Design a protein around this nucleic acid. Structure first.
Lengths: 45, 70, 104, 193
RNA sequence: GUUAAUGUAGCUUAAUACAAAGCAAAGCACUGAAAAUGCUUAGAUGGAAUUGUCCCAUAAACA
């Protein structure tokens, strides 16, 4: 099931805090990602 | 700093999650077990019916891979 | 009766962290399934944005095993993860001494 | 002996299920620790981007809300896989059956299995076979007879004329027991995902 | 109805004693992954005889 490995966390010692954003795809689908800045969503061109 | 009750509550839900994950493995293993048992059961039945078909079936397809799945 | 070749899986995903979770997750499933993993190498970033691709080596498969296994990958495959299946392409002193006698 | 073959088709679920609440709280926990261990007008931009999410609709996780009754449609379910299921009538039996076809030794299981894909669907539907190993075998006697249940995955479906006069029904797991009562047909779940 | 049944917890022909045991399995931490290591998790004798067959719950096929 996709939810088996959906809950994941960063495995890096030191880094700037990463913020979640949605990458809206060209077919409308969305996926959660971690981005450097506190953005809200991304659009696939 | 987190309060002790806050840690206790977070530990408890983690304890539920650990128990839930243990149930997931049992459910997934049993689900896989039924899938494997059915596949193994299918192997047993047709071998009785006709071993010749399996002799062809057990041969691999060179063009099957590379296989991409989304 | 034939045995499948060792086939690498190139796991391409936007985020390495999500890619890492699946790569380890499939590995542990692979270990339980008795799938040997010789290497888990990672390719360089697709610099232009960037993407991260990680190889999990898979060695050994059976026709029945492949059918059941590959499907399990489908369900396990989490949000926005793209699979891939491809056929595969310094020894130390103690090893050297043994080989010398063999070739002498 | 009466040689009969059949195919247990599988359709991938297009869109994943939503996370459970127990996962949601865990997501907050991992996020909270992530911030702790991390190393350290925008509102207008957020408003512009949040409405950008609204204006473009995402693919509905379930396309069932409009239909609620389209068993004959290929898109019966999205969160879970689908199985083709067509009513059949025999001389001595009348039962809801998995798609069946007649096979001969001249044709291998795959050849019959390919024929099952398009014979009872009379379309240009696209499916893939992984291996020649079958997934089920069930025999009913009145005279020797046997039914072979194969497995396949639906890459894509060009199912024109969704409202066929045939009784093809796509079921994930709920309708399998409802339509296929006898174990010889109610045990299809054993090799079903 | 006859078979075949399956009958301490995934496994064990551990045990019936002074304990329902050991092992497998699970979460978190530890950064390549895995393993190891530390801190944590969840459990069963259907139930007898008698052991190194019933017995009814159950039970497909016989029917």
């Amino acid at each position: 099931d996709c939810s088996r490995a959906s809950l994941t966390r960063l495995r890096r010692q030191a880094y700037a805090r990463l913020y979640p954003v949605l990458l809206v795809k060209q077919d409308g689908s969305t996926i959660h990602i971690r981005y450097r800045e506190p953005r809200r969503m991304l659009a696939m061109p | 700093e987190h309060s002790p009750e806050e840690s206790e509550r977070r530990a408890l839900l983690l304890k539920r999650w650990a128990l839930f994950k243990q149930q997931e493995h049992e459910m997934e293993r049993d689900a896989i077990r039924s899938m494997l048992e059915a596949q193994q059961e299918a192997l047993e039945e047709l071998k009785l019916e006709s071993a010749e078909l399996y002799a062809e079936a057990i041969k691999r397809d060179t063009s099957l891979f590379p296989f991409e799945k989304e | 009766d034939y045995e499948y070749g060792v086939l690498n899986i190139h796991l391409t995903a936007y985020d390495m962290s999500l890619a890492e979770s699946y790569a380890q997750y499939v590995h542990r499933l692979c270990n339980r399934l008795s799938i040997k993993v010789e290497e888990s190498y990672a390719m360089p970033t697709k610099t232009m944005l960037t993407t991260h691709e990680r190889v999990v080596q898979i060695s050994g498969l059976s026709a029945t095993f492949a059918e059941i296994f590959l499907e399990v990958l489908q369900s396990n495959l989490p949000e926005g993860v793209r699979l891939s299946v491809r056929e595969h392409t310094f020894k130390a002193r103690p090893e050297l001494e043994e080989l010398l006698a063999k070739l002498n | 002996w009466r040689l009969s073959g059949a195919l247990c088709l599988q359709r991938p679920p297009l869109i994943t299920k939503a996370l459970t609440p127990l996962q949601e709280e865990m997501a907050g926990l991992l996020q909270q620790i992530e911030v702790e261990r991390s190393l350290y007008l925008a509102q207008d931009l957020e408003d512009m981007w949040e409405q950008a999410f609204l204006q473009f609709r995402p693919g509905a996780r379930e396309t069932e809300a409009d239909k609620k009754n389209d068993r004959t449609s290929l898109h019966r379910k999205l969160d879970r896989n689908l199985v083709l299921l067509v009513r059949e009538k025999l001389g001595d039996q009348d039962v809801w059956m998995l798609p069946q076809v007649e096979w001969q030794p001249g044709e291998t299981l795959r050849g019959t299995a390919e024929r099952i894909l398009a014979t009872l669907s009379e379309n240009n539907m696209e499916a893939k076979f992984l291996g020649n190993a079958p997934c089920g075998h069930y025999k009913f006697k009145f005279l020797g007879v046997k039914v072979f249940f194969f497995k396949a995955l639906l890459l894509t479906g060009d199912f024109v004329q969704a409202g066929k006069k045939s009784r093809h029904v796509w079921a994930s797991k709920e309708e399998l027991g409802d339509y296929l009562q006898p174990k010889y047909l109610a045990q299809v779940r054993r090799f079903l995902l």
